[PDB]
Amino acid sequence: RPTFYRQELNKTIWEVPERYQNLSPVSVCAAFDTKTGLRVAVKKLSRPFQSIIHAKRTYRELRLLKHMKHENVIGLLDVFTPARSLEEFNDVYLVTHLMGADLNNIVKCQKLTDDHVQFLIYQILRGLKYIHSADIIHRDLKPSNLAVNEDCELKILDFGTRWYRAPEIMLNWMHYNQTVDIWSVGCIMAELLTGRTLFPGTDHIDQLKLILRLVGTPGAELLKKISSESARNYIQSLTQMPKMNFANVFIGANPLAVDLLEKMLVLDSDKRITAAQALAHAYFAQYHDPDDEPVADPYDQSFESRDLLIDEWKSLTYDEVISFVPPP
Ligand SMILES: O=C(NCCO)c1ccc2c(c1)C(=O)c1ccc(Nc3cc(NC(=O)c4cccs4)c(F)cc3F)cc1CC2
Ligand SMILES: CCCCCCCCO[C@@H]1O[C@H](CO)[C@@H](O)[C@H](O)[C@H]1O
Ligand SMILES: CCCCCCCCO[C@@H]1O[C@H](CO)[C@@H](O)[C@H](O)[C@H]1O
């Protein structure tokens, strides 16, 4: 059992093992793991077991992180608690690789080279194939959720502000496809290529307005998957927007880029390219290796439909902390 030491950070006492030094806020903190020589990120959970909803989300997060073992997905390096028993088990800390920046801090409103864009988006997609294969969707993919290196190695965070969001999430559709994350990728890719936000809506309705201007009004196939006739009649009522030509916004882009984007930013989520399909697109020829794009082991999400007592969630979480084996 390690020896801990306490300290004030983010307006609260953090008790962590000796090995982790130089905690600096980023609630998350950067640190240096002196035992393994890694810069790491330490997340202290916000009141993990005050309520049943808190306790389940604590458990969800730990279950997800213990499962993910992929180079482009944030994985778990340690999980600890200063408590010596379940009885006094009240705090949870999760440790991961510290990447250093996010895709915002990187791009910095500048335009990236096409090669650089390929490598970044390929990594995103490679990571999404993995997580999608475990039947997990991100739901909120965006630049500040993509942690990146000085070397540009990328890892996705917080899987399972409204600029990268699929139009159906925004409209409370409720039966999401994994291609909601593909919409977000399209938004990210286009921003990397031009230096600007593709859809910088001022609010909810302006966002949907800017989308429709680019992608045009919903088609006939799409309309017949919409139940509400009032929703339908409002739509067919609007000015009839043709889909825009993807060249005009992306002038001088690799035409393979424009092709992939056309396949990603399709209103109809059923008609969007999937992560695995996108990896095999020609835009990625220089990075694509079909035998190094792995899928996940199947992930038991049977706890999601359970309604249990707070002490049950808290105990399940305690068990997973106690069974944790650091990776190699
Ligand atoms: O080094 C940095 N700042 C120093 C000041 O310049 C820095 C700046 C930005 C970023 C990181 C590091 C960085 O590497 C980083 C690392 C982890 C992180 N979030 C984070 C997220 C999670 N959990 C999750 O992502 C998931 C929960 C559920 C499924 S995934 C976690 F368990 C621990 C974490 F630390 C956010 C970030 C944010 C991006
Ligand atoms: C003005 C914006 C119109 C948005 C139309 C988005 C259509 C989203 O696509 C819909 O996604 C649903 C699940 O999310 C699927 O069940 C539907 O089959 C699919 O058509
Ligand atoms: C800017 C106004 C756009 C409104 C479009 C709303 C239509 C989405 O309505 C969605 O239709 C689905 C399939 O019929 C239903 O299952 C969902 O409950 C509903 O959210």
Task: Compute, in degrees rounded to 10, the torsion defined by CA atoms 299, 303, 305, 307.
Answer: -170
DSSP 85-101: SSTT----EEEEE---E
Catalytic residue among 78, 135, 151, 158: 158
Question: Quick check: CB of 35 below 6 Å from ligand 2?
Answer: no
**Residues near 318 by beta carbon (within 8 Å), at least 6 away in sequence:** 86, 89
Element (DSSP H or E) covering residue 29: strand 28-33
Closest ligand 1 atom to the C-alpha of 147?
A: 39
CA of 271 to the centre of ligand 3 (A): 17
Beta bridge pairs of residue 14: 7
CA 102, CA 143: separation in Å to the nearest integer? 6
* Positions of chain breaks in the chain, given as the residue before each break (C to N > 2.5 Å): 26, 160
CA angle 130, 162, 229 (to 5 degrees): 95
DSSP-derived letter for residue 202 is S
User: What domains are defined for the chain?
Assistant: 14-100 (3.30.200.20), 101-295 (1.10.510.10)
The answer to whether the Cα torsion of 289, 292, 293, 295 is positive or negative is positive
Beta bridge pairs of residue 24: 30
Q: Evaluate whether 20 touches 33 at the Cβ level (below 8 Å).
A: yes
Q: How many residues does the chain have?
A: 328
Q: Evaluate whether 267 touches 218 at the Cβ level (below 8 Å).
A: yes
Question: Quick check: CB of 88 below 6 Å from ligand 2?
Answer: no
Binding residues: 26-28, 43
Binding residues for ATP: 26-28, 43
Nearest CA to ligand 2 atom 2: 167
CA distances from 243 to 51, 126, 160, 237, 267 (A): 48, 29, 32, 17, 11
Amino acid type, 187: C
Q: In Å, what resolution does this model reach?
A: 2.3
CA of 277 to the centre of ligand 2 (A): 20
What ligand has the least distance to the C-alpha of 232?
3
Closest ligand 3 atom to the C-alpha of 172?
A: 20
Beta bridge pairs of residue 29: 25, 42
Nearest CA to ligand 2 atom 14: 176
CA 54, CA 57: separation in Å to the nearest integer? 5
CA distances from 304 to 34, 48, 221, 287, 328 (A): 37, 17, 33, 36, 29
Method used experimentally: X-ray
CA of 195 to the centre of ligand 2 (A): 28
What is the token pair recorded at 286? 């220089």
CA distances from 249 to 200, 202, 209, 246, 323 (A): 14, 20, 16, 6, 52
Q: Evaluate whether 98 touches 153 at the Cβ level (below 8 Å).
A: no
Q: Evaluate whether 148 touches 159 at the Cβ level (below 8 Å).
A: no
CA 114, CA 286: separation in Å to the nearest integer? 12
Rounded to the nearest 5°, which phi and psi values hold at 326? -60, 145
CA distances from 110 to 56, 194, 220, 252, 254 (A): 40, 8, 38, 16, 17
Q: Evaluate whether 213 touches 200 at the Cβ level (below 8 Å).
A: no
Residue 158 annotated in active site: yes
Nearest to 16 by CA among 43, 37, 38, 48: 43
Q: Evaluate whether 74 touches 138 at the Cβ level (below 8 Å).
A: no
CA 39, CA 32: separation in Å to the nearest integer? 4
What ligand has the least distance to the C-alpha of 175?
2
* 282 burial level (CB within 10 Å; 0-12, 13-18, 19+): exposed
Q: How many CB atoms lie within 10 A of CB 203?
A: 9
Question: Quick check: CB of 146 below 6 Å from ligand 2?
Answer: no
CA of 61 to the centre of ligand 1 (A): 14
